[PDB]
Design an enzyme around this catalytic site. Sequence first.
Site, mmCIF file in Angstrom:
data_model
loop_
_atom_site.group_PDB
_atom_site.id
_atom_site.type_symbol
_atom_site.label_atom_id
_atom_site.label_comp_id
_atom_site.label_asym_id
_atom_site.label_seq_id
_atom_site.Cartn_x
_atom_site.Cartn_y
_atom_site.Cartn_z
ATOM 1 N N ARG A 151 -7.245 -1.147 11.226
ATOM 2 C CA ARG A 151 -8.633 -1.010 11.645
ATOM 3 C C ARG A 151 -8.776 -0.730 13.138
ATOM 4 O O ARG A 151 -9.753 -0.087 13.549
ATOM 5 C CB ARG A 151 -9.410 -2.267 11.253
ATOM 6 C CG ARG A 151 -9.692 -2.331 9.760
ATOM 7 C CD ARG A 151 -9.960 -3.742 9.266
ATOM 8 N NE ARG A 151 -10.131 -3.759 7.817
ATOM 9 C CZ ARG A 151 -9.130 -3.736 6.941
ATOM 10 N NH1 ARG A 151 -7.872 -3.709 7.364
ATOM 11 N NH2 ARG A 151 -9.385 -3.746 5.642
ATOM 12 N N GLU A 357 -4.979 7.828 -20.316
ATOM 13 C CA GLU A 357 -5.092 9.251 -20.008
ATOM 14 C C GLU A 357 -5.424 10.067 -21.254
ATOM 15 O O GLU A 357 -6.189 11.037 -21.180
ATOM 16 C CB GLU A 357 -3.798 9.755 -19.367
ATOM 17 C CG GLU A 357 -3.489 9.154 -18.001
ATOM 18 C CD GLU A 357 -4.631 9.323 -17.020
ATOM 19 O OE1 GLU A 357 -4.859 8.407 -16.201
ATOM 20 O OE2 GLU A 357 -5.307 10.372 -17.071
ATOM 21 N N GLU A 384 -14.351 7.211 -17.038
ATOM 22 C CA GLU A 384 -13.402 6.156 -16.704
ATOM 23 C C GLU A 384 -13.585 4.931 -17.592
ATOM 24 O O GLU A 384 -12.601 4.256 -17.916
ATOM 25 C CB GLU A 384 -13.563 5.767 -15.230
ATOM 26 C CG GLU A 384 -12.275 5.433 -14.517
ATOM 27 C CD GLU A 384 -11.192 6.423 -14.829
ATOM 28 O OE1 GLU A 384 -11.231 7.542 -14.278
ATOM 29 O OE2 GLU A 384 -10.323 6.092 -15.652
ATOM 30 N N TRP A 459 -21.868 -5.410 8.706
ATOM 31 C CA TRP A 459 -20.798 -5.272 7.726
ATOM 32 C C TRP A 459 -20.110 -6.608 7.472
ATOM 33 O O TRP A 459 -19.836 -6.963 6.318
ATOM 34 C CB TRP A 459 -19.790 -4.225 8.200
ATOM 35 C CG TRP A 459 -18.547 -4.143 7.362
ATOM 36 C CD1 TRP A 459 -17.350 -4.755 7.606
ATOM 37 C CD2 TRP A 459 -18.373 -3.391 6.153
ATOM 38 N NE1 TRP A 459 -16.444 -4.434 6.623
ATOM 39 C CE2 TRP A 459 -17.046 -3.598 5.720
ATOM 40 C CE3 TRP A 459 -19.208 -2.560 5.399
ATOM 41 C CZ2 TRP A 459 -16.536 -3.007 4.563
ATOM 42 C CZ3 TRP A 459 -18.705 -1.977 4.250
ATOM 43 C CH2 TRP A 459 -17.380 -2.201 3.844
ATOM 44 N N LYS A 463 -20.146 -9.136 4.244
ATOM 45 C CA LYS A 463 -18.877 -9.589 3.679
ATOM 46 C C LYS A 463 -18.866 -11.100 3.494
ATOM 47 O O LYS A 463 -18.420 -11.603 2.456
ATOM 48 C CB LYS A 463 -17.710 -9.161 4.571
ATOM 49 C CG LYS A 463 -17.278 -7.716 4.388
ATOM 50 C CD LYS A 463 -16.237 -7.560 3.281
ATOM 51 C CE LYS A 463 -15.527 -6.212 3.390
ATOM 52 N NZ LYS A 463 -14.896 -5.794 2.105
ATOM 53 N N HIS A 487 -12.376 5.885 0.209
ATOM 54 C CA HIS A 487 -13.602 6.452 -0.346
ATOM 55 C C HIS A 487 -14.669 6.675 0.716
ATOM 56 O O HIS A 487 -15.500 7.580 0.578
ATOM 57 C CB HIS A 487 -14.128 5.556 -1.463
ATOM 58 C CG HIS A 487 -13.174 5.406 -2.604
ATOM 59 N ND1 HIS A 487 -11.982 4.723 -2.489
ATOM 60 C CD2 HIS A 487 -13.227 5.863 -3.878
ATOM 61 C CE1 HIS A 487 -11.345 4.758 -3.646
ATOM 62 N NE2 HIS A 487 -12.078 5.443 -4.505
ATOM 63 N N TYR A 497 -17.651 2.543 -9.623
ATOM 64 C CA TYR A 497 -16.703 1.534 -10.081
ATOM 65 C C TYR A 497 -17.416 0.283 -10.578
ATOM 66 O O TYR A 497 -16.884 -0.436 -11.432
ATOM 67 C CB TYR A 497 -15.721 1.196 -8.957
ATOM 68 C CG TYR A 497 -14.975 2.417 -8.471
ATOM 69 C CD1 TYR A 497 -13.964 2.984 -9.240
ATOM 70 C CD2 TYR A 497 -15.299 3.023 -7.263
ATOM 71 C CE1 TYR A 497 -13.290 4.109 -8.817
ATOM 72 C CE2 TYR A 497 -14.630 4.152 -6.830
ATOM 73 C CZ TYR A 497 -13.623 4.688 -7.611
ATOM 74 O OH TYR A 497 -12.952 5.809 -7.186
HETATM 75 ZN ZN ZN Z 1 -8.857 7.446 -15.690
#
Ligand code: ZN
Lengths: 596, 195
Positions: A151, A357, A384, A459, A463, A487, A497
């Site tokens: 960082r 997969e 996903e 931030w 957290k 990301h 996600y």
């Molecule tokens: Zn996948």
Amino acid sequence: STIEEQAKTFLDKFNHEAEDLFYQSSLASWNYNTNITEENVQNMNNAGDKWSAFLKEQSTLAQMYPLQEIQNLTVKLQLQALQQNGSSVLSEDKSKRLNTILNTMSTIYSTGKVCNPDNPQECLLLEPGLNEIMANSLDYNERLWAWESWRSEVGKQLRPLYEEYVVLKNEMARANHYEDYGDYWRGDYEVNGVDGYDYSRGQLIEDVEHTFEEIKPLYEHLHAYVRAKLMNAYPSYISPIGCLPAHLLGDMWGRFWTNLYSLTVPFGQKPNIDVTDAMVDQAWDAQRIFKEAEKFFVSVGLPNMTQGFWENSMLTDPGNVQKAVCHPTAWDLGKGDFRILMCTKVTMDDFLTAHHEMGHIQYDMAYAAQPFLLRNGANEGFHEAVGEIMSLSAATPKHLKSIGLLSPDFQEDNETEINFLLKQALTIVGTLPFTYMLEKWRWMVFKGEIPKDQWMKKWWEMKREIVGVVEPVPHDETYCDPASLFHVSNDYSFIRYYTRTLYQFQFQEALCQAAKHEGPLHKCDISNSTEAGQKLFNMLRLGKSEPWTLALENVVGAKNMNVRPLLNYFEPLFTWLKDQNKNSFVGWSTDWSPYA
Amino acid sequence: TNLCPFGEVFNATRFASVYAWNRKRISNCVADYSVLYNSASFSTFKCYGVSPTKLNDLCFTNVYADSFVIRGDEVRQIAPGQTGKIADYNYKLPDDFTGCVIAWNSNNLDSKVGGNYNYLYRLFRKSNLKPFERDISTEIYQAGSTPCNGVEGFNCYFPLQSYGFQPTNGVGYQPYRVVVLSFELLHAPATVCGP
Ligand SMILES: [Zn+2]
Ligand SMILES: *[C@@H]1O[C@H](CO)[C@@H](O)[C@H](O)[C@H]1NC(C)=O
Ligand SMILES: *[C@@H]1O[C@H](CO)[C@@H](O)[C@H](O)[C@H]1NC(C)=O
Ligand SMILES: *[C@@H]1O[C@H](CO)[C@@H](O)[C@H](O)[C@H]1NC(C)=O
Ligand SMILES: *[C@@H]1O[C@H](CO)[C@@H](O)[C@H](O)[C@H]1NC(C)=O
């Protein structure tokens, strides 16, 4: 001819032109990914540049048909998807500036190195060097050095770039008539003009927050158990009421708590189910692994793999001098060409990845008959989620016992059930506050609710409050710690996600009910259930042609994201956690920090 | 014993594009139809009106052999009363069709790495084709209301599109060679009998 008839004929030409141009680019990309040469990187670029140029030109032509004069919705979906300006609503100068910012942030992340004090040549990259430390080391100071150095040397480079990136992304989004770039990202869930199935961009914020309140109790008790276990290992570094130090979480960010399993495992004398030895004992190879995965999908009524799949896929490391990118990937090249790229080893992990997969492939095959632009998951989290539920079933002792890899003389005792559910929760539940917290901060930055001079202050406030994690070193506004995650510096939305995690347990619960599974949800195996296979296929063949609210209702009977199936899956752990934490503090104070 | 020249239709080096489908009038010869229907090299061999099963016991005045190439998923369109790009714009069989449709996969011949673009089909047309009609025109299709001036542009499309036959395509996208046998019966000679 009306304007809608003109758009139908325009989309007709596009679909036929795109199908072949996308195929060529996918073919060149495949040849590079399985055979790394300089000749292949250029052919991949040339075919990709033509396909991108073709898209740029077709987007401009599509903008000449105003959506306001189209009624047929399936025509409006494709026209809108192709019309989207993207960065091309900005001036060429701001676009070029933004693309330079994006490429610099990506290069800093992937070439960022950190050198140890007193040897300026012993330097580590994030992958594999720093990641190895953060996933394997138990030494407090080594983990702290890697966490802070990443960082302090790479994150600080990203701070000025990320500031300019926010300004230009917000200009792009507001010119596309969104409130900001976060509102633009939430557009992936937007549904309009389908009575009873509509969904607004702001409704995603409310649904994510509403379902996250219901996650908090399970997380609080997972957090409290993990903190108590770590406090036994690190008594002088961990407060019994404080947050977890950010550098003691199993990877560079605490995105997943997976690698805390060894220090937190409830019953450390009961070994994992590890079926790799039986696979080697029976001389399985990669083809057997993928043949078993094909059997699994055929057992629920899905088609077998195409002949081209077996002929054209790469299921083993080519080995030798011929090199390949070995990250497992499912390829939908178009024109009925479906392939898996995977450097399969004979392991239980790769046996599960192959089912995952091949789940992607089944999704791709099922919506192949849709028009080109609707050949995708119902929204960003569907594909996903479909892949994850396949490894859920394939990994159960019931399934591994029916294919002859798990001994009939292995029976499930509750202690191994708790070990398994805790391992699952470390990965699946542990990431939910991390994921929600990160996207919330991005949404607030794009919204303008966080001034520049409080980015890092807010931030680490969030957290501590939301995630129960505390920074081991104070960070001023020269840091950009969020951008130290792939990301964020690589411009990918992150809420997918979270939504995918809730979808997958909604899918699994619905499919296991259709398969008439009795007992705890986490032991279910949908094999041999054509009723489960049909219920899933009814969603799969939709692609993007229907609203995601309707596609979800096809599988689960409800129109919205729902957290109850996730809680149902982890209920045996939740009860055991609540009993374990009877004489521990549950919750966290936000003012404690390791730097006192 | 003049034998009907079926080898020049079925074993041709290159087939015609479906939009420009080829017709070979067969005459004054002896056709051993059974050899085809009982050879097991074709994936499609469906007859309408006549019966494949030993009807090489009939006399016809003229027999036409139409041949072309399409993708496998489009073979279903070579049949009476079918709709689709092939049936409507390239090759149209009548509702009362008396004859046979024969097809086989030609991926080994008509595909090429990088793509074989020799074969075209008509993607746009102002109207549907009459049965056994053939449109080989290249007029730019006017999709809007502004004249095209003979070039493509906004709402102005070249009407013919190419199949890109690559050996790695799925079966539905692979090339298939098609032979359509028409059996005509006029109040006249009857010259193709063929024991
Ligand atoms: Zn996948
Ligand atoms: C690898 O790529 C080269 C061209 O870059 C090609 O000539 C060669 O045949 C390829 N090898 C394999 C095994 O695909
Ligand atoms: C939309 O158009 C497609 C083809 O143009 C057609 O098949 C479909 O039925 C239409 N839907 C509606 C609701 O008109
Ligand atoms: C897939 O199943 C079909 C029957 O539905 C069979 O004809 C075909 O040969 C099978 N192909 C493979 C690769 O298993
Ligand atoms: C095409 O050639 C093969 C091999 O020479 C032969 O068996 C077949 O009969 C020929 N086709 C026709 C229609 O005669």
